[PDB]
RNA sequence: AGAAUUUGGACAAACUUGGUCAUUUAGAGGAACUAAAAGUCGUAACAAGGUUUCCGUAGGUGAACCUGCGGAA
């Protein structure tokens, strides 16, 4: 029993140079066997005779999606971690500057929402992936959807301050 | 045609000398109207929203990396 994760040709060279830190938790912590098909540009994970294949698939799928090495190791460990993918889909007007509104100047809005909601976000052209806990993904996604659908920067930043406080608060 | 006697002298800028119009009074009076300001400390209020990871190309190049431009997720 096996899984195949297709590595796109824009995350291929980081996979090869950081490959030597990717396969050791895949081959001794997880006890899988791992091959990298250079023909199909894919990663194959097979099970030996001696429920972790989905964990390894999510590990390399996070790296495939665009999350860094330590972020992917954080997904491989830390059972309470999830990752949500969505396109914008809500062109000059709407597509070419809603993503500029998520980013901001030097990505400071994305950095602010990452630190406020304790997720971390990779923003493609229009493909947003979010790695966090369940409630953390909920709040980061609500704020990202907010500032692609139109909200004032004061409103989204006040909501970010408030969500940081209430997510870290007991009671 | 010069020159002065002129040949006759109309013309005449500047100087005396009464009224008209505009303005200054050295200024001083009169008797009207209108106006008259007592309140620590108050800001930077003032403003837009292209990040990650590759790929090509031009330049700066230890051909590494950076920057600009063009694409991909």
Distance, in Å, from the CA atom of A13 to the CA atom of A1, rounded to the nearest integer, reads 27
Query: What is the phi-psi region of residue A106: left when phi exceeds 0, alpha when psi lies from -120 to 50, beta otherwise?
Result: left
Query: What's the CA–C1' distance between A123 and B30, in Å?
Result: 94
Strand B within 7 A of A14 CB? yes
Strand B within 7 A of A138 CB? no
Cα torsion through A15, A16, A17, A19, rounded to 10: 70
Bridge partners, residue A89, by sequence = none
Name residues whose C-beta falls within 8 Å of residue A21's C-beta, 6 or more positions apart in sequence.
Answer: A69
Residue with minimal CA–C1' distance to B50 is A100
φ, ψ for residue A130, nearest 5 deg: -130, 125
Sign of the alpha-carbon torsion through A111, A75, A9, A140: negative
Query: What's the CA–C1' distance between A8 and B54, in Å?
Result: 10
Strand B within 7 A of A69 CB? no
Query: What's the CA–C1' distance between A105 and B47, in Å?
Result: 14
Distance, in Å, from the CA atom of A71 to the CA atom of A10, rounded to the nearest integer, reads 18
Distance, in Å, from the CA atom of A143 to the CA atom of A129, rounded to the nearest integer, reads 13
- A14-21, long-range: CB < 8 A, 24+ apart: A15/A63, A15/A64, A18/A69, A21/A69
Longest dimension (CA), chain A: 57
List the resolution, Å: 3.2
**Resolved by:** cryo-EM
**Surface-to-core class of residue A111, CB atoms within 10 Å of its CB (0-12 exposed, 13-18 middle, 19+ buried):** middle
Query: What's the CA–C1' distance between A165 and B25, in Å?
Result: 86
Of A139, A124, A120, A38, residue with least CA distance to A81: A120
Breaks (C-N over 2.5 A) in chain A follow: 50, 90
């Amino acid at each position: 029993e096996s899984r195949k994760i297709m590595v796109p040709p824009h995350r291929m060279t980081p996979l090869r140079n950081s490959w030597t830190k990717i396969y050791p938790p895949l081959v001794e912590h997880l006890k899988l066997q791992v091959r990298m098909n250079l023909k199909t540009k894919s990663v194959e994970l097979r099970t030996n005779p001696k429920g972790a294949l989905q964990k390894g698939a999510d590990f390399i799928k996070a790296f495939t999606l665009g999350f860094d090495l330590d972020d992917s190791i954080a997904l491989l460990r830390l059972d309470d971690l999830y990752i949500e993918t969505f396109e914008v889909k809500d062109t000059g007007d709407h597509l070419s500057r809603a993503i500029g509104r998520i980013a901001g100047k030097d990505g400071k809005t994305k950095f602010a929402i990452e630190n406020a909601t304790r997720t971390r976000i990779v923003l493609a052209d229009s493909k947003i992936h979010i790695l966090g806990g369940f409630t953390h993904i909920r709040m980061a996604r609500e704020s990202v959807v907010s500032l692609i659908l139109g909200s004032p920067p004061g409103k989204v930043y006040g909501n970010l301050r408030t969500v940081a406080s209430r997510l870290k608060e007991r009671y």
